[PDB]
Homo-oligomer: A and B are copies of this chain.
Amino acid sequence: SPPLCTLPPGPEPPRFVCYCEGEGFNLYVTDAAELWSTCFTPDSLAALKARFDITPRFRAACEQQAVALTLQEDRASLTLSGGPSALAFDLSKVPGPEAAPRLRALTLGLAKRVWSLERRLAAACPGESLINPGFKSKKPAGGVDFD
């Protein structure tokens, strides 16, 4: 299962989603309108690991909600807390045409995971005078009774 988390962690509606794919491995942070990615490459991925698998660390941070985000124009940074040393990742805005297919597939994968988890979670004419048409049939004289 691909780990992910939603920010802010409070009861307010979510504004950003952080997730990882395919450990080309990259860390994706998006607000469903723009996508920020680390743009990792096989040469750069090894270099960052030497300076400091990343998915178990990212998965642990998502479960603990220890992910800090700072967004400023096209520059984004993701901070993971929980390990012996804090991990800081630099993210750049994905171009619109490039980011569209990734947000395209993101909605499909999340929606199936919602249904799949729920599927597994659940397994755990009257009154008319005939003589005179169109008129009431009068009641005859009745007088008064004694009771």
Interface residues of A (CB under 8 A from B): 1, 4-6, 13-15, 17, 19, 30-33, 62-63, 103-122, 124
3 closest pairs, A vs B, by CB?
A: A110-B110, A32-B104, A32-B107
Collect the chain B residues with CB atoms within 8 Å of residue A116's CB.
6
Q: Closest residue to A19 on the B side, CB-wise?
A: B111
Q: Are A4 and B114 in contact (CB under 8 A)?
A: yes
User: Distance in Å from the Cβ of A62 to the closest Cβ of chain B?
Assistant: 7
Q: In the complex, what's the smallest C-beta–C-beta distance from A130 to chain B, in angstroms?
A: 39
A114 — which chain B residues lie within 8 A by C-beta?
4, 110, 113-114, 117
Are the CB atoms of B115 and A117 closer together than 8 Å? no
Interface centre among A105, A106, A115 (most CB of B within 10 A): A115
Nearest CB of B to A39, in Å: 20
Collect the chain B residues with CB atoms within 8 Å of residue A120's CB. 121
The answer for the CA separation of A57 and B53 in the assembled complex, in Å, is 45
| Residues of the B chain whose Cβ atoms lie less than 8 Å from the Cβ of A31 | 108
Are A115 and B33 in contact, with the CB atoms below 8 A?
no
Query: Contact at A117–B121, with CB atoms within 8 Å?
Result: yes
A-B contact pairs, 22 of them (CB 8 A): A4-B115, A5-B115, A14-B108, A14-B109, A17-B107, A19-B111, A31-B108, A32-B105, A32-B106, A32-B107, A33-B104, A103-B104, A103-B107, A106-B107, A107-B107, A110-B111, A110-B114, A117-B117, A117-B121, A120-B121, A121-B121, A121-B124
